[PDB]
Symmetry: D2
Subunit: 450 residues, 4 copies
């Protein structure tokens, strides 16, 4: 009840910007990490939000993860005066960056390559659907299922289809170097719309080129990502179920099974897993969630995900504090249903599993001294059922581990492993405990007090 195993991530936006210095404290006290969406964030909004986060972290001695979420590529209506669409109207799309008023301009051939007859085109976030009735060289006709106004610059998605667009997106490249002066304060970079390992690697090389030392979080947002889940999971540092986005490509009744499959796959492969968006959605307008939202959060957390990410609920909603407060409160009630076990792929895995089961058998807390976070993460993936205290001499490692299952990262300067572990045991050595360190090729050490 008292300390959460499921980690709590909130998105920062205008609703958090205006928080009284004292409201802000009570808000950050209830999170383990923060997200900044580089779609809606100005470089000096990013800079100022991160500064407020790091300032809080210093004052309260609480390592917090900073996540930046990249926009990713998009296909948008080109230049046009607003086009008014009537229900039943046959609407024409042409490959063009500018129309003469008689059609909808779409400046990307990948839209035309993705669309077939009977596909459904989604505009206005999914509020305008158009049924495709004919296709040609660089054009499409579609029947509007309702009335609506199409504006230049609005995004276009094809229900259940992925766009074949070269990556990383030019706008992502631009956003990453704009923010590169503060790269040492960024713990996770979240990739949108990746569907192959090649896509992920490209962002990795770019982040390296630009001097970032960040974990790469891969959002599963589309049918194409779901069909390539095995390989995508294995090339990620962190996996994210992006519910809002995935809801565009699946029926609303089909989404629970897809969420389950993403979560099962990530746990199997020992990748940390998040569920994002549409958790406490009603709370944009209400200081209390609905009963169904409480059950939703409760059962999502029970599956054994590492973290839950609030988006609009905190970014733009009316009750950012109530939202994180209700998140944390629900989590304190969670009983976890025996999670998918990860695959054992080496000796170190067998060691960590044996440790976790031992601590479970003795009713013991696990303590880890970890230089880079490696053993701490290996322990976490086996889902220990109590808090795992992790001592580290690197503040950047402490921040990274803040959003990993059960981990409580503590900044502890130390000359070597043995000195580090003894400082951690001094500090957190209530009985029973199982305390370890160990690196590949070295002696692994365990101190057990029963």
């Amino acid at each position: 009840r008292a300390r959460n195993l499921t980690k709590r991530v909130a998105t920062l936006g205008p609703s958090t910007d205006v928080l009284r210095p004292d409201e802000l404290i009570k808000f950050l006290d209830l999170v383990d990490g923060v997200r900044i969406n580089l779609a809606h964030a100005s470089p000096n909004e990013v800079k100022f939000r991160i500064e407020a986060v790091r300032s809080y972290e210093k004052a309260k001695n609480r390592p917090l993860a900073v996540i930046v979420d990249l926009k990713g590529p998009s296909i948008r209506v080109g230049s046009t005066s607003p086009i008014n669409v009537q229900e039943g109207e046959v609407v024409k799309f042409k490959l063009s960056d500018k129309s003469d008023g008689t059609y909808i301009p779409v400046p990307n051939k990948a839209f035309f390559s993705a669309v077939e007859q009977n596909d459904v085109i989604l505009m206005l976030d999914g509020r305008l659907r158009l049924k495709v009735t004919n296709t040609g060289s660089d054009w499409i006709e579609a029947v509007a299922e309702s009335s609506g106004v199409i504006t230049g610059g609005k995004a276009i998605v094809v229900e259940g289809k992925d766009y074949d667009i070269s990556t990383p997106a030019e706008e992502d490249v631009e956003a990453l170097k704009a923010i590169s002066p503060i790269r040492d304060n960024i713990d996770y970079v979240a990739i949108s719309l990746a569907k192959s390992c090649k896509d992920v690697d490209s962002v990795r090389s770019l982040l390296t080129e630009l001097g970032f030392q960040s974990q790469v979080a891969v959002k599963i947002e589309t049918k194409g990502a779901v069909n390539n889940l095995e390989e995508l999971v294995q090339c990620s540092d962190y996996v994210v179920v992006a519910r809002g986005d995935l809801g565009l490509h699946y029926g609303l009744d089909a989404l629970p099974i897809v969420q389950r499959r993403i979560v099962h796959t990530s746990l199997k492969y020992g990748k940390p897993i998040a569920v994002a968006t549409q958790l406490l959605d009603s709370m944009q307008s209400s200081p209390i969630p609905t009963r169904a939202e409480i059950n939703d959060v409760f059962t999502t957390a029970s599956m054994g995900v590492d973290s839950l990410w609030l988006t609009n609920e905190t970014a733009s909603g009316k009750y950012p504090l109530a939202a994180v407060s209700w998140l944390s409160r629900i989590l304190m009630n969670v009983e976890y249903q025996i999670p998918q076990s990860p695959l054992l792929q080496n000796s170190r895995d067998r060691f960590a599993k044996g440790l976790v089961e031992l601590a479970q058998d003795l009713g013991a807390n696990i303590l880890v001294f970890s230089m880079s976070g490696t053993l701490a993460r290996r322990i976490a993936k086996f889902r220990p059922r109590g808090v795992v205290y992790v001592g580290t001499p690197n503040v950047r490692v402490a921040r990274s581990l803040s959003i990993v299952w059960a981990l409580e990262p503590l900044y502890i300067p130390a000359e070597n492993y043995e000195e580090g572990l003894e400082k951690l045991i001094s500090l957190k050595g209530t009985t029973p405990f199982v305390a370890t360190y160990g690196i590949r090729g070295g002696v692994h050490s365990v101190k057990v007090k029963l």
Copy 2:
């Protein structure tokens, strides 16, 4: 479809045109009538409509009748008073700092002063966290049952409200027997008192119901998922059919599509392995009754089930039933049961077979009863003896592979297996 679907009839189902009523009943396995709200003649008309559909479509449906139970029947900040509230047991239960709840827990009154035949508090009647000590069955449950007793042969389940002990349940059973009912007793778990007494209460029930609305009044909003889970796990452990009722597709009272959170809630609740889910207000009085059962049924078709709590093996008929389920599962086979009482069918269902179980029976009332038990598909099959009945069931539903069975306590059990 393994999880069974129950809808409540009310004003909104009454007004349905003939073709719309067919589409509605096609999407449920049983129906609930709330005796609190229905008049005797609404009860009669709704049962007649159900049995008439059942005869036309050749599909047995359970009729559940829901009893009111022994319940006790404004400005922000006001000091409000209460008086002989015709029931004494209210003033016996209430204390200082207790919360009194009104209009379904919408307005809360923190008791400032306790008196004698009175109380005062700072803004059906409930005391949060407390059970009233009212002797059972209530007078008006006796009245309601006596009044529908001429239609008793068409009542499959009688659902009891506010039980907290086996005595509550046994008393209703005696009353039903006296009035000539042959109904199963469904016990709603609605209070802290029921939850604290869960073990004994589950074991003396014929069917257990998580009544989420009523129970939500005694628990925090964030505490109720754990309680639902304990209730479901306990019923499954003791081999009792289990339903979750109310607050499933609540937003559908005003919209023909549920929220995503409601879809997830329905999905995860079904995934636990409950026998049935009961819609209440969403169909009884809501604007979109057909959309509601259409959506329940659709969500259920996507469900993948999570390995349920296994029941205790209490005897060798249990070991027999469990072995048949594991056998059928290992052969990829359907189970067929011929039964006069439904007893072997229910024993097999409690081990949660993952395919439809076809149950042949010559007793139409048994077939109606089984329609809201997990996985069971009951078919009316007249037969002179068990062997003949099983031969006819196989003849009718014997797509291979199958495991087909009958047997009663102390008799030779027969199994036919086609691989």
Copy 3:
């Protein structure tokens, strides 16, 4: 205790021939099957022994298996006056059917192909060992490790080497047609020195050519058989650990592991398994066995073998009756150690396994109605822990099943399965019972009384 699960096989010889009509009854009352060794058996000895067996079977209504054991090929010293060998003497072997006195004649090139320098040659049942010191075209020199007399016609074995000799042996072919007039009374034919599936198939085709309807029992006698165990087991009807013979090719300390491996392999593949020879060996001279022999029989039976075969103990020994009496008595004491489970290779296997575990769970006896013995055998291989009553309308099937684990075969004439099963239930239907029949492609029926 009262009825054995492990079946008891005795070899008939001169010691049983002379049994008083009344001693014979008490002897056969204690066996489930009889072996006749066609090495030492004259066709009219075979005929008369079988007649006495079938006569007893009729009188006592007890189906008994008759096993005939084939001689198999051998390499024997050719024609020569006795050769006296001194310890340390360098002895010469030449390819020849007749010597001039100066060497040992061996009329089979396969001997010369099998022998290398440092091999050990075994004569006089293993009592004369010779160490090979040089080899040539069609000759060998070897140093005698002790004194001895080599006689023409004596057998020669190379320790740990197999002979490449074409099969079936001409003498086996001769013995099988000599006995072919009484072929309908022969239930098992035991093959010596097979080391490939081809060898087994050749005996199968010969037995078919000659009108036999017998199960083929394959003796594992050599290192070459042990190295080809997987395939040899899978082509057998019945497997036999021939301890005496295998003891020539392995150290005496190495034999327990080889026995275990043969038994484990046979159980895995659902082949009935016997252990033969050297069970109650001291009993040739004593009416009581040694303590070590009691432990040996006890532990061999515990492994879950279908049968134990006495050889010399009954064939030529002084106490044939005490020997079978002590065998049966020891078995009544056996507690069985959870045997190797057979592989599930079809639906019928899953059915039979499920039945056996069910009967185990209900504390029930299994009853089977079986036309050819097929389901009865499939049940037996899963090692039910109580007697399995088997009704059959074929007396030849009843005899076959007599030496299969736990089976009690009963001759029951019946028109069909359903009538057969109801006669069996009438006869053996003490509660609890699990009674079945079923053939491939048909309805399998189970009657369960709890």
Copy 4:
């Protein structure tokens, strides 16, 4: 070599030439001296020879001393009489139809008449199936122990005969403590009375011994394998080291090669997972002592072990030990233990690790004690503290992979793992 080898010293080992004695002691992990047969000076000379070898070869050996115990000390068909047989308890125990056994059960006498101070019967002294009621320790056990008490620091195990209750065992323990012994008490299970009381007796023993010779007198020849199995299974269940003694290579008294049946018996007995096997007559008085231990040791090198009865987990030190064994097994690693008392080493051994466990200790007496426990290879390692001792053990036997450990009750347990 995981199963430990014990030989009895006697006339045949005494006469061994220096080089032959070295070859003999090289093939055992402990030695037994039978105080029934040895004089005090044979005891002294044989212990001195053992400790002298141990010092020269740097290998600790357990010295087991076997106590006589409270035992009571012709033509075919004759009527034989018995008289105040100096012990009364004989005539208290014997009845009509009982069998009296003489000269190791070779001749049997069926009691025809019971008298008072006498008996008559139709053809050490034993009554088949019966235990005498003689108070313990016996006078001559007190005598034998007092007489070897100056060499007590060189006695690792004292083996008790004919115990049937915890009181028998506790009494010997008090006597040993009084005389200043620090020996383990080995309890021989030798009678029906011990077997009927097996549960309590096993739990108060330091080491359990199946004495097949003595026990064979009270059971049928065909009944003894089941009894041995129950004894072994029970000791393993309660985490007690277990030996099988006598009648292992009996024919080797007169032949330098065992029978096949004896090889099988040794093999299957070792395969059950016993700590040790004890040769008695085969080495003490037989013609071929060296061949006997040479053959025991050879058979043991072929043994494949059958998954043994697992011990009860009674506390969290047990859960710790078992987890280390399973860990080492999963890593393909050797276990190293540094220990002052041998307690953690014995706790690890009872979970039956399938590799050698190297145990470092600065207490030579502990090292001698551990040499007849399953899998343990004790090394004398002087160390100032536990950390230093484990560092030295690792330095010496740290072939990777290894799981290396120390820890005492209520202290921080330390494990070092190299993968």
